[PDB]
Design a protein around this ligand. Structure first.
Ligand SMILES: [K+]
Ligand SMILES: [K+]
Ligand SMILES: [K+]
Ligand SMILES: [K+]
Ligand SMILES: [K+]
Ligand SMILES: [K+]
Ligand SMILES: [Mg+2]
Ligand SMILES: [Mg+2]
Ligand SMILES: [Mg+2]
Ligand SMILES: [Mg+2]
Ligand SMILES: [Mg+2]
Ligand SMILES: [Mg+2]
Ligand SMILES: [Mg+2]
Ligand SMILES: [Mg+2]
Ligand SMILES: [Mg+2]
Ligand SMILES: [Mg+2]
Ligand SMILES: [Mg+2]
Ligand SMILES: [Mg+2]
Ligand SMILES: [Mg+2]
Ligand SMILES: [Mg+2]
Ligand SMILES: [Mg+2]
Ligand SMILES: [Mg+2]
Ligand SMILES: [Mg+2]
Ligand SMILES: [Mg+2]
Ligand SMILES: [Mg+2]
Lengths: 306, 121, 173, 113
RNA sequence: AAUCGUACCGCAAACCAACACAGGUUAGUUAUUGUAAAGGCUGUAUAAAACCAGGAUAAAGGAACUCGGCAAAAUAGGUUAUGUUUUCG
RNA sequence: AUAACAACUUCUUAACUGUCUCUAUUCUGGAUUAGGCGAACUUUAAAUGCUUGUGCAGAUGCAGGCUAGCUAACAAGGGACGAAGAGAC
RNA sequence: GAUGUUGGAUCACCGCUUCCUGUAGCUGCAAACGGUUAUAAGGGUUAGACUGUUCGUCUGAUAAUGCGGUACGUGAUCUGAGUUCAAAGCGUCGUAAGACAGUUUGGUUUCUAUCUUUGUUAGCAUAAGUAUUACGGCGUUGUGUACAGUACGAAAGGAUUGUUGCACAAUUAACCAAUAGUUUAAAGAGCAACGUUAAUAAACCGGAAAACUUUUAACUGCACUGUGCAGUUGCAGGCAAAGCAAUGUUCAGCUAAAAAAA
């Protein structure tokens, strides 16, 4: 929580007028910027905006080489720019994105007030992405769709994991426990020692003990984008994604990729301009042989003969 | 998936019948499978080439644990067996009564691929 | 609605082993048929409501297979006869929801919650239930929609003997 | 799932086999330069789970003993399936006993092609 | 032919253990092939933590556990040609 | 020395197994949640942080350097030279 | 008027006098393998036979199997094999009762947490949302192989270098389409690893808070001791020919609706 409020005092009559004039001057702002939607060149240090999606589940498919690929399906319902931040008023440039849809009578008036004032639907989630220059700002209302990504790139995913409840040390931290037999008495699954004696004389912070487990923010890096379906706003990603079904997931261009890789992919920047409806379904192509080890010695073999 | 100190049946004609794993090579983990080379001790042998109490190298050829392929399928045997090898990496026999699988299509197992009777590929 | 659990069938445990659990529920189901209204604890009422609906379904079936299953549930011959004859004709057109549950506060001694379970169409009913077959206005969007999706929608109660059976009997005699 | 199943059915047409039938399955070995082989064996387990359907094939050899394979049904590596015979059994316990005691399951001693 | 016992509890909430005590307490009788006649008795309201106790099932390996095969598991039963040891049983 | 015998101590073989590599799931009861009923060890006085230094020579309470929302619940057991019995050696 | 013994199980914090993975000189350093000095404590430091052991000897692998402090860390967390009570045997000593500081077999391990320390969660206290910066936590690992039989060298032998490429192991983070195990008021359920995906970084995670924005300054509840990313054509109930927490749906419960005419 917060600390108790500090006392306040009225200002002397010889200083009150001066303070108010200066405070008002600092709080006076100029006109809001008007972003323009136009393609821009990509520079060595230039970050794009992400997107807010919903986790659907897992499936599998076979690729051109006949290999089974596990996939996770992400759906983008409706993602729009709902606000902007700029240096004059906030000190830095950022873009605010919202997704989802809720009914007016199920949210607080404070939340609904912001969206109604700009003629936007009340959205369930809101998240901010920081940009590098004012020219990277997007006009309010712009849609972020599945066409924002290029099939075959790498992405990062973030979300809250599945709740597990109150769990012990063996399941929560992987402690070994104690023997099942040979005289053990009522301590099969207990953590054992938690300290020493008079020195140091206390228990250290963050000592591993039982507690609640499963609802925390986690990020997976370097996942591969396998298939894209712009018309239905679907993304197929190889690997596991944190969270249960319906979890809110943030998708971003992976930081593991170098500038050269981004140039080769020719990623849209600032975003895709056009109608995503008239786009086909694409599957990435891998120029690799998963069965090369049967023709050439590339595998791991520790023994040297002779 | 065979842990250390497991018993194996010999499927070559070198004379050995029963061996026990006593060590691993490299860093294979806590268990070994088909295609790995291990160190074994001979427990029961009837022949002049080998005798009980010796230590030899061997290669795992069959196992009861599932062996997974990239296409999603797997197969299983009903026994665990191995073939004894020399220090130069060659078999100590000339006839192997076992079913060779895809693991031995690799170039380093040419000799085994010649003396084996039945092959799955 | 009734909560679903992780055990086989998703039923309540009623704080009993499975053997005693089944003996208890069968007895209460027999009494519900006899008296049509019972007051008990919330957990036993929720389990009885879902179990009672599935017992009425067997009666509506009116088959040899259904009777064999019910004969192992009902404890009295009189209650079993009523289920297949009286209740079967009562709920011909009602599709589910043959039992209702209304909460009635807390008890005195152990302060446990209680509820009342009752059948949904009879004399002495707590409330008046909606008709088994919903009437459809002649000039409503609902009528047009049902025609496009389900041409075999039932709008009024049907007679015990349909016209095809009546026609066959007339031709025979 | 249903969209992928529809496409698969347009590409392949397999018979409706059951447990206890003897099958001949044509497969491609990606390890061995994508060569074609024909396997004959007994069907011991069949799972009907839509696009994840699979079955198990069992066979016995002259000296090496029993051999079991688990095969996805919609895997593209499989090219054809045919029914060639039937083996009678009483129940699951009888079938399991037959598998453990290798006997009268040596339809073909080796693989063709 | 007078005199004393006859109610009630009696493997138990009524007797010996400070208790409505998981302990202790003699004899006589009864149904029952794979079962079992008579008679007798009966639990505040729920559930999808950790942990503890008493059970069940378990891939591949099978004493690698440990002071120690502790505990658990295990075709456990019957008949044998032949051989060994005996104080000859 | 010795046949037989042994809930005696020692070593080995066969088989078997969650003893173990390495654990997972689950049933019954307690814990845990709610109503009713209703104990015990203990208690100089308390509004009872860390660290180094000091000192009847190992500090919640003394000196320096640090530490600022409040009261509890469920859980673990480092310290209070923790409780029990006027040390048996 | 009592500070529980040796060794181990389980889980730890710190020093550097560095065993391995690093950096820079010298060499009786051609290469390879070494020797020695200075500097460096992020990660790692193996599975077994004998022995109650610490220690010690040995076996197969390993990049390597470092030392010390912490009541010779750790029994209100476990173990009781040794040592250290009452029984008994043997040897030696004593006339004897008995003794060993010798050996052998057997021999009870209590505690419901008030204060402080630590892991989680709720209520209360200044409306809610987005939140630069700051502060705190975590620690960026290791082996083999290819680039090469090339540099070096009479021959033999045999490299350096890399924000290198590839395969594998440990650790950490999640995940449940498929594979293995598990429940009979059953199953294409749920939870799980023996299964799958990812990481070698100015990355990742936690709480306070400036500023900004919105408001008539906000504030229970779906049986709610799993989750509500479900609040009234809302729903994991019922019912159907249906993939069975999905699709369809007239019933049940919470929460019933409309001016006439032009
Ligand atoms: K700490
Ligand atoms: K996932
Ligand atoms: K039913
Ligand atoms: K004895
Ligand atoms: K304590
Ligand atoms: K070093
Ligand atoms: Mg364990
Ligand atoms: Mg005890
Ligand atoms: Mg125990
Ligand atoms: Mg097992
Ligand atoms: Mg041992
Ligand atoms: Mg309870
Ligand atoms: Mg001090
Ligand atoms: Mg102090
Ligand atoms: Mg004294
Ligand atoms: Mg140093
Ligand atoms: Mg130490
Ligand atoms: Mg100590
Ligand atoms: Mg202690
Ligand atoms: Mg004595
Ligand atoms: Mg004597
Ligand atoms: Mg004498
Ligand atoms: Mg004894
Ligand atoms: Mg799940
Ligand atoms: Mg239902």
């Amino acid at each position: 929580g917060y600390r108790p409020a500090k006392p306040v005092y009225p200002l002397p009559d010889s200083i009150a007028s001066l303070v108010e004039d200066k405070i008002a001057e600092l709080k006076k702002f100029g006109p809001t910027p008007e972003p323009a939607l136009e393609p821009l060149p990509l520079t060595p240090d230039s970050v794009r905006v992400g997107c807010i999606t919903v986790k659907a589940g897992m499936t599998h498919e076979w690729d051109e080489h006949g290999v089974m690929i596990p996939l996770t399906v992400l759906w983008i319902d409706e993602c729009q720019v709902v606000g902007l931040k700029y240096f004059e008023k906030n000190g830095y440039y950022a873009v605010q994105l919202g997704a989802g849809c809720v009914k007016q009578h199920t949210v607080l008036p404070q939340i609904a007030g912001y969206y109604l004032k700009h003629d936007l639907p009340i959205k369930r989630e809101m998240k901010e992405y920081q940009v590098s220059s004012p020219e990277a700002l997007l006009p309010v209302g712009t849609h972020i769709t599945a066409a924002h990504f290029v099939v075959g790139q790498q992405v990062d995913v973030t979300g809250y994991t599945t709740d597990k409840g109150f769990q012990g040390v063996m399941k929560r931290w992987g402690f070994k426990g104690m023997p099942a037999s040979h005289g053990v008495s009522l301590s099969h699954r207990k953590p054992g020692a938690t300290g020493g004696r008079q020195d140091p004389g206390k228990i250290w912070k963050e000592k591993k003990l039982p507690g609640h487990m499963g609802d925390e923010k986690r990020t997976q890096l370097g996942l591969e984008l396998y298939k894209v379906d712009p018309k239905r706003n679907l993304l197929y990603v190889k690997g596991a994604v944190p969270g249960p079904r319906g979890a809110s997931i943030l998708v971003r261009d992976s930081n593991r990729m170098d500038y050269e890789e981004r140039v080769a992919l020719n990623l849209p920047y600032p975003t895709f301009i056009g109608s995503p409806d008239e786009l086909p379904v694409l599957v990435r192509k891998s120029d690799k042989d998963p069965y090369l080890m049967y023709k050439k010695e590339i595998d791991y073999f520790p023994i040297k003969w002779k | 998936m065979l842990p250390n100190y497991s018993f194996l049946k010999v499927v070559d004609n070198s004379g050995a019948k029963l061996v026990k794993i006593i060590g691993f090579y490299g860093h294979p983990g806590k268990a070994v499978g088909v295609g790995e080379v291990v160190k074994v001790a001979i427990k029961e042998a009837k022949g002049e080439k080998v005798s009980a109490g010796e230590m030899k190298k061997a290669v795992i050829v069959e196992q009861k644990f599932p062996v997974f392929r990239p296409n999603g399928s797997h197969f299983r045997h009903l026994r665990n067996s191995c073939v004894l090898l020399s220090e130069k990496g060659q078999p100590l026999g000339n006839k192997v009564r076992a079913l060779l699988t895809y693991e031995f299509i690799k170039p380093r197992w040419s000799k085994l691929r010649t003396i084996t009777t039945k092959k799955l590929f | 609605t009734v909560k679903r659990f992780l055990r086989p069938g998703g039923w309540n445990r009623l704080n009993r082993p499975v053997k005693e659990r089944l003996a208890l529920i069968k007895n209460m189901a027999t009494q519900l048929v006899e008296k049509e209204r019972i007051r008990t604890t919330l957990s036993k009422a929720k389990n009885l409501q879902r179990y009672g609906d599935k017992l009425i379904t067997l009666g509506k079936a009116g088959t040899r297979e259904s009777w064999l299953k019910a004969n192992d549930i009902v404890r009295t011959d009189r209650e079993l006869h009523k289920l297949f004859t009286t209740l079967a004709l009562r709920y011909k057109d009602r599709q589910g929801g043959y039992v209702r549950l209304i909460r009635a506060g807390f008890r005195r001694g152990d302060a446990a919650p209680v509820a009342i379970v009752e059948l949904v169409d009879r004399e002495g009913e707590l409330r008046q239930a909606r008709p088994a077959v919903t009437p459809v206005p002649k000039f409503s969007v609902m009528r047009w929609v049902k025609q496009q999706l389900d041409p075999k929608f039932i709008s009024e109660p049907a007679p015990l003997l349909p016209p095809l059976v009546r026609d066959y009997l007339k031709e025979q005699n | 799932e249903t969209e992928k199943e529809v496409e698969f059915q347009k590409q392949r047409n397999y018979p409706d086999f059951k447990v206890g039938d003897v099958l001949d399955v044509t497969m491609v070995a990606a390890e061995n330069e994508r060569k074609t082989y024909v396997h004959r064996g007994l069907c011991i387990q069949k799972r009907d789970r839509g696009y994840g359907s699979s079955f198990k094939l069992y066979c016995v050899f002259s000296d090496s003993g029993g051999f079991i394979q688990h095969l996805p049904l919609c895997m593209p590596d499989i090219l054809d399936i045919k029914i060639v015979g039937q083996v009678d059994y009483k129940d699951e316990e009888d079938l399991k006993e037959l598998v453990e005691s290798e006997s009268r399951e040596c339809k073909f001693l080796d693989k063709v092609l």
